[PDB]
Amino acid sequence: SKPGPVQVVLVSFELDEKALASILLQDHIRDLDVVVVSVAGAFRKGKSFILDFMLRYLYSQKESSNWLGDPEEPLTGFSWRGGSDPETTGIQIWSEVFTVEKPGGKKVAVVLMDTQGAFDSTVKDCATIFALSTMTSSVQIYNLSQNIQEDDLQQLQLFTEYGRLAMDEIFQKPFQTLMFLVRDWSFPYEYSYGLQGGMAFLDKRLQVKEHQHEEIQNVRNHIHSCFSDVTCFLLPHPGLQVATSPDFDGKLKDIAGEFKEQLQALIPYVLNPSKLMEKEINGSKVTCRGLLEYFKAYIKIYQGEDLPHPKSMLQATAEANNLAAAASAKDIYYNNMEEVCGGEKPYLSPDILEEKHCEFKQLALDHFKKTKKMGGKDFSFRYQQELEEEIKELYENFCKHNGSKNVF
Ligand SMILES: Nc1nc2c(ncn2[C@@H]2O[C@H](COP(=O)(O)OP(=O)(O)O)[C@@H](O)[C@H]2O)c(=O)[nH]1
């Protein structure tokens, strides 16, 4: 009953769909728009240290004020690396999804994602892990040591023709925020720690120059077709005790002061309620229920020998987008009907049951049609017709359950 990391993508690659569904289709979050914060990068680069502070912020927020902690008390990690073979490639998420009220009262679900791979441009693939993580997250925090290297940028080539395809055919950038998190920044006299120094440094690194390799200048020329926002944050060194310790357990006061300072800017910048950014695809928000569909559609196309064609990535996106609309409509029909004739609630005469059915079927189909969907009308119809068959089967079970409560 204790929260912990859940392996959702593992070694080709497999989606553990049951484990992911058990988190995302919980009753209290499945209908909420979901915020998906991913930290991605090479093994042993401090990703889980940052994930731990994000959890401290989220748990402090859940139960309140000094999120950083008590300076006298030792730190304890949250066990993102507790399993066998911690250097393994894959994607984990935290088992506790948080519910946060944004200003004005809208409640959203907040998922934390741990994306680990070799991250080195050669022989094998973890590009699959970076792609799946990027396409499903709303903030991809790309965790790098000391600088943004040309190798680092070359790994974004995965998305370049995808971004160019989507702009050309759907008139929209496919992804939201990419943030370069530069660890152990050592030149504050050139670019100061934090966000303003980071954006000046990123601007310089993103400039195309004739000596760079062709593929890297490509990435520079099209990264802004992929992400609606590209940002960078320079974080200081945490101090030698953190750097040289396996499983750091020293007191908060033993962490370097400038690191703590910049942590208090970085973590709220990502997780403060006014900053939470719901996942969006095709310009419409994704719920925990819908997010499951994107994982299921994306795992399929990354099964092959080679990386998928961009047309197949757009195709999988369109299919999952319509399935997400259908699933949301199906839940509306089911929840309303179960409220009215489910359980041991009293028998309803066929006239009353039919009327309720007609009311909630129309509600459900209207919701599907009103929802913004990719593919055009003929593409979306096949999903609508599928939804109508599901509703018909649901209605039959509701009718047979209702009839079992009849007297004689
Ligand atoms: N130099 C440095 N070391 C860090 C930082 N954050 C964590 N560490 C240490 O680096 C090692 C690997 O950290 P870990 O968070 O497990 O890396 P992960 O594999 O990316 O999750 C551990 O000894 C950490 O205590 C940092 O910002 N800078």
Side-chain angles (χ1 to χ4, degrees), residues 43-62 64 66-72 74-84 86-121 123 125-203 205-209 211-214 216-250 252-279:
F43 175 58
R44 234 161 199 195
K45 294 296 176 190
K47 295 187 308 299
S48 76
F49 208 51
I50 284 300
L51 290 169
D52 282 357
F53 282 108
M54 287 179 170
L55 288 169
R56 294 184 181 103
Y57 181 95
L58 289 171
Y59 278 109
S60 178
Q61 177 183 56
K62 190 197 185 190
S64 34
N66 53 284
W67 72 266
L68 218 47
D70 163 18
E72 301 313 304
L75 267 67
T76 312
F78 280 95
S79 288
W80 293 94
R81 306 279 169 250
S84 268
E87 65 284 315
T88 175
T89 300
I91 295 177
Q92 299 179 110
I93 75 182
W94 198 248
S95 63
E96 189 162 358
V97 177
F98 303 89
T99 295
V100 180
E101 228 182 291
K102 286 170 79 45
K106 183 193 190 193
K107 284 177 273 109
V108 301
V110 182
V111 166
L112 280 187
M113 182 181 285
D114 166 48
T115 303
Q116 192 163 268
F119 284 85
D120 85 309
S121 34
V123 177
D125 290 28
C126 78
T128 295
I129 293 292
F130 198 24
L132 291 166
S133 164
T134 303
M135 313 170 70
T136 61
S137 67
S138 55
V139 190
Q140 178 67 283
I141 304 187
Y142 191 12
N143 185 79
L144 300 179
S145 188
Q146 291 182 122
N147 174 47
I148 288 144
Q149 283 164 50
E150 301 286 300
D151 313 298
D152 296 323
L153 301 166
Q154 183 274 330
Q155 294 204 251
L156 299 166
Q157 93 184 0
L158 260 43
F159 315 125
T160 37
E161 271 46 60
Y162 184 40
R164 303 174 89 219
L165 171 63
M167 293 204 77
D168 283 347
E169 321 216 339
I170 70 178
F171 312 139
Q172 300 167 87
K173 306 180 183 200
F175 305 136
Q176 291 165 274
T177 291
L178 173 68
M179 175 195 283
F180 295 91
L181 178 60
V182 179
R183 301 295 281 275
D184 313 329
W185 183 246
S186 300
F187 314 100
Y189 49 93
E190 297 184 335
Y191 302 88
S192 34
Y193 304 130
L195 181 65
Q196 203 130 323
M199 311 305 308
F201 178 69
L202 171 73
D203 208 88
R205 298 294 297 119
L206 284 188
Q207 292 185 320
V208 176
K209 288 186 261 140
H211 66 272
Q212 296 143 2
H213 192 57
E214 199 174 337
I216 321 311
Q217 293 174 180
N218 264 187
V219 155
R220 284 179 168 93
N221 282 329
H222 294 112
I223 186 174
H224 291 293
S225 294
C226 296
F227 296 93
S228 36
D229 292 285
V230 185
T231 58
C232 172
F233 190 106
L234 321 173
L235 192 66
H237 196 284
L240 306 189
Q241 189 175 350
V242 168
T244 57
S245 158
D247 198 8
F248 171 78
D249 56 357
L252 190 66
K253 63 177 161 189
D254 301 333
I255 305 179
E258 284 207 277
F259 184 87
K260 289 184 281 202
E261 275 177 41
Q262 295 301 320
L263 220 45
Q264 303 194 270
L266 160 68
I267 306 282
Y269 173 75
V270 174
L271 292 177
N272 170 273
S274 61
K275 314 285 294 136
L276 295 173
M277 190 172 50
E278 301 97 310
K279 174 70 166 162

Side-chain angles (χ1 to χ4, degrees), residues 321-343 346-359:
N321 179 269
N322 278 263
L323 285 169
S328 159
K330 181 186 159 155
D331 287 356
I332 288 175
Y333 173 82
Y334 179 88
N335 287 157
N336 279 282
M337 283 291 293
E338 174 88 357
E339 154 87 350
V340 152
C341 68
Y347 174 88
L348 295 184
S349 70
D351 280 328
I352 301 294
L353 188 62
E354 189 73 19
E355 99 173 11
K356 289 282 161 84
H357 162 78
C358 290
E359 174 185 345

